[PDB]
Design a protein around this ligand. Structure first.
Ligand SMILES: CC(=O)N[C@H]1CC=C(c2ccc(-c3nc4nc(Oc5ccc(C)c(C(=O)O)c5)[nH]c4cc3Cl)cc2)CC1
Ligand SMILES: CN[C@@H]1C[C@H]2O[C@@](C)([C@@H]1OC)n1c3c(c4ccccc41)[C@H]1CN[C@H](O)[C@H]1c1c-3n2c2ccccc12
Ligand SMILES: Nc1ncnc2c1ncn2[C@@H]1O[C@H](COP(=O)(O)O)[C@@H](O)[C@H]1O
Ligand SMILES: Nc1ncnc2c1ncn2[C@@H]1O[C@H](COP(=O)(O)O)[C@@H](O)[C@H]1O
Lengths: 435, 184, 303
């Protein structure tokens, strides 16, 4: 008999490539010849790096995900030595190879591919996931030239009040703060990478490239890149906004969706709140047994959601760039103004601040956990409610001579009292003691 | 079905697998690029196996070994029920790692390296209450907040012994920016 | 045919559906001075604020502009003398003298509770504000009003068949009060106007000139401008002088006719974002007042 390497009825063949974690091999069905992509993850190698939780979360996300521009995960086969991830196979290969072969991608096809990439990116961000490794090498193409993002890894979840500092990605596609090794929010980091992809599609070159690595990162931090004469004035402004050095000034998916160049020939089924989206995409919200293509109440929720979403100015405020005012607007106090600040600010030494924090907490009978020299997990038992109030303290650097102590509530387990009031009162006690 | 992977990482131009399940008979392994593999359907329990590389008996040193009474050194792999379900397998890999403590009123000792607090993210300075909402909108309304500034405290400078605190909290898909005027 | 379609709608929708995506809530500690609290309502642009008792560790009540009216009318003496009670009283000290022989517990709603329950609660307790408190965390999420309920219902009128009452006139349906209408003259002092809002518990007083025409309206909301302009110490001034600040960007008193259909009254109230309209006949003689309280009581509770 032949020594054919078989896994879950699939015959393993040539290696398609090596990702951030694991080896990817082609799989063809023993009976039909159906092609799949099998990512093999060595169990001991996962234990050796202590990224079990990362692999566990990576599998969880790819199972839930359902998007036409993200590589679909069919099944995971567990063996005593390895993990076999059976995925959707795409014959077209890397977008990087397509850009190289044609030298430069035409405006019509470049926009079509970018619209698909941004749709897949928006799906991840709405599902609290950030890829952190967007590049034409990680963007695959199907027989019908449709872009499907892949190589989830070097990626992490997005939680409320938390930031990500891990430096992930290739230097040419990494944002200025990743290069700098600074804390960041998830979405603007992926948008910078998409900006480089759009530049690479339309030009066939990188906006920030150099042989000398320190010069390359100086180029990224400076944000100075060539805008060739063949690029139209409209697409030039989009690239300039997406590749903005300042993350607060940087373009959002909402800004790109509104941009005149991006809007052209954009299908009505790619983004939410679009005429064809509600009719072509199944809402995750399930209300346990599944009933499809049979009469009866899911669409009633879809209709009700559409009315409320259409009714803007009712659920959200409209920031200003004649106009009737609201009858309940109240006049200014009499020529008086006030400004809010994030936290108590000190100009003294970092350990001088921390020593005062420990002295203030012990006088207030607080119980704390030392996570980092500048990061604590503080607790206090409320006497009336008989519950525990949890919060997180973190010292940051505002400027070279200026510091800040950040206060953040821990949402875990107050029916008798109030969780938000418990946090404010715990903060007020600490601020007053520090004087 | 119960698949078990037998991968020979070492060098060689000819590699055979011989184990207790094959009654110590030489099974040929197909090569890719210095990788001789075979996937076999095997039941639960301990299995003694060895490799026959280029006409010589050898073992994989990266795997457990059970030496026989006559000095026969061969590898052993124990098939486990947990090894076939991925979540169960990952559950074991977390426990096997074996790599913070209780709530204490003791201050943390100064770092031996001694280095600097992290640079404040620009996203946190985007104060929601310092922004104008427009005359037409209901004054109670606010714009959609960034997830990174949620659960974070924001305060006003103490005037006449009254402290004003604020934080943006999220209930389901909706957000609330609670303000509290509390005299000290 | 079913006239209970709006009743079934209110019973099916939770209070959560009305809460905005992003909104602000102002909370006051019961130990805070009322003058500071009334000034804080202006600087934050809010009419009402839930009260937090730190000793009991529970939400006790609400501080509205009605509390300011009640403080001014009870303690004002002259424009020559300071109102010591407004200048020195704490929220807790004021709540003790107001709830004396008339104590009141906290009237609230859960975000999981139906809107039918919220509308019923507002009518039964004769209130305008209703705090939405989550029973899990104990946090006050939003201050629910009549304006919010009707504007939400207005978005869904095209989703269900309109009942026969919508196509019927206000005279045939008899919605609103048409007897003993509380009004003020153009020269009426502010202190007098405050005395009528307490004695009658009404939210607005139409301003009528000596000839007999309704030039302006004096709402409970307009009273908070006395704190904003810091003109609360002089209540001898006329209501015309008190409303002089809004002379610009004011079309006039929003009125409605008895012959006009209920549907057009609701649309006009939702578009203007106001609490009430003055009812007049074809002859234009004032017939009465139609507030959202009368609208919601007729569309939700009566079927
Ligand atoms: C006719 C023919 O050529 N048949 C086949 C011969 C063998 C083939 C083959 C099929 C699968 C494997 C395989 N390769 C594995 N690599 C594993 O761990 C890794 C994963 C990723 C990397 C980068 C490494 C590594 O460090 O080399 C090891 N586990 C593995 C488990 C298996 Cl079963 C190795 C070779 C493919 C075609
Ligand atoms: C650096 N890029 C490579 C290109 C290559 O291998 C990688 C490592 C990278 O892709 C992200 N790999 C690909 C995929 C994969 C998934 C997870 C992690 C890394 C991955 C799949 C998934 N289905 C695809 O068919 C298939 C595809 C793959 N690669 C290919 C080369 C040619 C044809 C298909 C492939
Ligand atoms: N100025 C007024 N005079 C007499 N009744 C009024 C006046 N304003 C409102 N009402 C009535 O009082 C009730 C509640 O008033 P409101 O505070 O506007 O909700 C309703 O039945 C109104 O019709
Ligand atoms: N019918 C009306 N015509 C004109 N202004 C009104 C009317 N009803 C209320 N207002 C104004 O609307 C504002 C809010 O008051 P309220 O409607 O009680 O919330 C106040 O400044 C009132 O003077």
């Amino acid at each position: 008999h032949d020594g054919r390497v078989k896994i879950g009825h699939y015959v393993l063949g040539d290696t398609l490539g090596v990702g951030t974690f694991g080896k990817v091999k082609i799989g063809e069905h023993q009976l039909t010849g159906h092609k799949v992509a099998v990512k093999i993850l060595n169990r001991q190698k996962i234990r050796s790096l202590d990224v079990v939780g990362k692999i566990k979360r990576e599998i969880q996300n790819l199972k839930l995900f359902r998007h036409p521009h993200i590589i679909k995960l069919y099944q995971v086969i567990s063996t005593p030595t390895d993990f076999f991830m059976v995925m959707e196979y795409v014959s077209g290969g890397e977008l990087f190879d397509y850009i190289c072969k044609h030298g430069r991608v035409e405006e019509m096809e470049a926009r079509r591919l970018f619209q698909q990439i941004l749709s897949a990116v928006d799906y991840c961000h709405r599902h609290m996931v950030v890829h952190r490794d967007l590049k034409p090498e990680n963007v695959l193409l199907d027989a019908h030239m449709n872009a499907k993002i892949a190589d989830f890894g070097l990626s992490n979840m997005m939680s409320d009040g938390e930031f990500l500092r891990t430096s992930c990605g290739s230097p040419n596609y990494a944002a200025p703060e990743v290069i700098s090794g600074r804390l960041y929010a998830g979405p603007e980091v992926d948008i910078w990478s998409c900006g480089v992809i759009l530049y690479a599609l339309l030009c066939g070159t990188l906006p920030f490239d150099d042989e000398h690595v320190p010069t390359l990162f100086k180029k990224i931090r400076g944000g100075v890149f060539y805008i060739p004469e063949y690029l139209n004035r409209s697409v030039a402004t989009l690239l300039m906004h997406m590749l903005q050095v300042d993350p607060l000034k940087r373009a959002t998916i909402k800004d790109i969706r509104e941009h005149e160049w991006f809007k052209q020939g954009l299908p009505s089924y790619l983004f939410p709140e679009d005429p064809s989206y509600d009719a072509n995409v199944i809402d995750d919200e399930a209300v346990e047994s599944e009933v499809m293509n049979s009469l009866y109440a899911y669409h009633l929720i879809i209709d009700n959601r559409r009315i409320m979403n259409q009714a803007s100015e009712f659920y959200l405020a409209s920031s200003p760039p004649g106009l009737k005012p609201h009858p309940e607007r109240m006049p200014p106090l009499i020529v008086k103004k006030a400004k809010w600040h994030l936290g108590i600010r000190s100009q003294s030494k970092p350990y001088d601040i921390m020593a005062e924090v420990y002295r203030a907490m012990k006088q207030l009978d607080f119980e704390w956990k030392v996570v980092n020299a500048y990061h604590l997990r503080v607790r206090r038992k409320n006497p009336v409610t008989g519950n525990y109030v949890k919060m997180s303290l973190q010292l940051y650097l505002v400027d070279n001579r200026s510091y800040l102590l950040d206060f953040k509530s821990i949402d875990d387990e107050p029916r008798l009292g109030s969780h938000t009031m418990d946090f404010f009162e715990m903060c007020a006690s600490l601020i007053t003691t520090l004087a | 079905a119960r698949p078990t992977v037998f991968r020979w990482t070492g060098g060689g131009k000819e590699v055979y697998l011989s184990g207790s399940f094959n009654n110590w008979s030489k099974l040929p392994l197909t090569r890719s690029h210095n990788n001789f593999v075979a996937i076999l359907d095997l039941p639960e329990g301990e299995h003694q196996y060895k490799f026959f590389v280029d006409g010589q008996w050898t073992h994989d040193p990266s795997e457990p070994i059970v030496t026989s009474q006559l000095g026969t050194v061969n590898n052993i792999i124990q098939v486990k029920k947990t090894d076939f379900e991925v979540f169960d397998a990952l559950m074991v890999d977390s426990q096997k790692c074996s790599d913070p403590g209780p709530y204490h009123q003791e201050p943390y000792v100064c770092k031996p390296e001694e280095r600097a607090p992290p640079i404040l993210p620009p996203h946190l300075l985007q104060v929601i209450l310092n922004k104008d909402t427009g005359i037409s909108c209901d004054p109670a309304l606010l714009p959609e907040p960034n997830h990174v500034m949620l659960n974070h405290l924001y305060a006003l400078s103490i005037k006449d012994g009254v402290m004003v605190l604020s934080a943006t909290h999220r209930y389901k898909k909706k957000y609330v920016t609670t303000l509290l005027y509390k005299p000290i | 045919s079913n006239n209970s379609v709006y009743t079934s709608f209110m019973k099916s929708h939770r209070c959560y559906d009305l809460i905005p995506t992003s909104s602000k809530l102002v909370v006051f500690d019961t130990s805070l001075q009322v003058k500071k609290a009334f000034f804080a309502l202006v600087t934050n642009g809010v009419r009402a604020a839930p009260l937090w008792d730190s000793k009991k560790q529970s939400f006790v009540g609400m501080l509205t502009i009605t509390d300011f009216i009640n403080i001014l009318h009870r303690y004002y003496k002259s424009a020559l003398v300071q109102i010591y009670e407004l200048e020195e009283h704490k929220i807790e000290t004021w709540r003790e003298v107001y709830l004396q022989d008339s104590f009141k517990p906290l009237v609230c709603i859960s975000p999981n509770a139906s809107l039918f329950d919220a509308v019923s609660s507002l009518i039964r307790n004769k209130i305008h504000r209703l705090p939405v408190i989550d029973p899990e965390s104990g946090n006050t999420l939003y201050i629910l009003t009549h304006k919010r309920i009707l504007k939400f219902l207005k978005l869904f009128i095209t989703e269900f068949p309109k009942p026969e009452f919508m196509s019927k006139s206000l005279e045939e349906l008899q919605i609103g009060t048409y007897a003993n209408i509380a009004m003020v003259r153009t020269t009426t002092p502010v202190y007098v106007a405050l005395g009528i809002f307490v004695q009658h518990r009404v939210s607005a007083l139409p301003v009528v000139d000596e000839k007999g025409r309704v030039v302006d309206i004096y709402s409970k909301f307009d009273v908070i401008n006395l704190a904003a302009e810091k003109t609360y110490n002089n209540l001898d001034v006329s209501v015309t002088k008190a409303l002089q600040h809004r002379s610009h960007y004011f079309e006039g008193v929003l009125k409605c006719y008895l012959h006009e259909t209920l549907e057009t009254i609701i649309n006009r109230l939702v578009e203007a974002e106001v609490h009430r309209l003055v009812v007049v006949d074809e002859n234009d003689v004032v017939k009465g007042i139609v507030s959202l309280s009368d609208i919601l009581q007729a569309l939700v509770l009566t079927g």
